[model samples]
Target: GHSKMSDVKCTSVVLLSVLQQLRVESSSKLWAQCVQLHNDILLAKDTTEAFEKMVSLLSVLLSMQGAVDINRLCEEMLDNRATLQ
Candidate 1:
């Protein structure tokens, strides 16, 4: 439980940061989904629920215009492996 909580917290921060960088339009459906997902994560009953929400949120974000390249992002992260790893 502790590990899952920590993972969710970290994922939330990274997702939030990425969403912010995208500067999604407030009127956009993707933006609405992201906001809802953000709230859902905060109120998530368990790690599984949080993980599901996160995956859904990422899918929505990826469908947005000019969204970041997830594969490239993952590669970059792997290339510059963080000390936390």
Candidate 2:
């Protein structure tokens, strides 16, 4: 069990670590791997599972420091959701 502030702080620290990894690595390998896994889930006839995985992946990227332009990321996510619908 975690308090709200503790959860937030933990998330922030994880995001900072992710940012450090991104700084050292070029390209979006993490994103690509998530997408691949999502496709695999979809192929297994688990649509909801696939979508959930995708959302989880996006959440990670969204939480990562400096990984994306926050405003643009939100807009893009909205657009993607609309398209999916």
TM-score for each candidate, following the candidate numbering: 0.48, 0.35
Instruction: Give the Cα-based TM-score of candidate 1 against the true structure.
Output: 0.48
Locate the minimum summed-lDDT window of 10 residues in model 2: 3-12
lDDT of 2 by residue, 1-85 (tens): 2322222222223233434545523255543333343333333344455455545655666565345432333343344445554
In the range 1-85, model 1's lDDT, one tens digit per residue, is 2223222233334344566676766455554455445545545666456555556555666776446643333333333333223
lDDT for model 1: 0.49
Candidate 2 off by > 4 Å:
1-32, 66-85
Show the colliding residue pairs in model 1: none
Each model's backbone clash number: 0, 0
Residue 34 in model 1: lDDT: 52
Error at 46, model 1, angstroms? 1.4
Regions of candidate 1 where Cα sits further than 4 Å from its true position:
1-17, 69-85
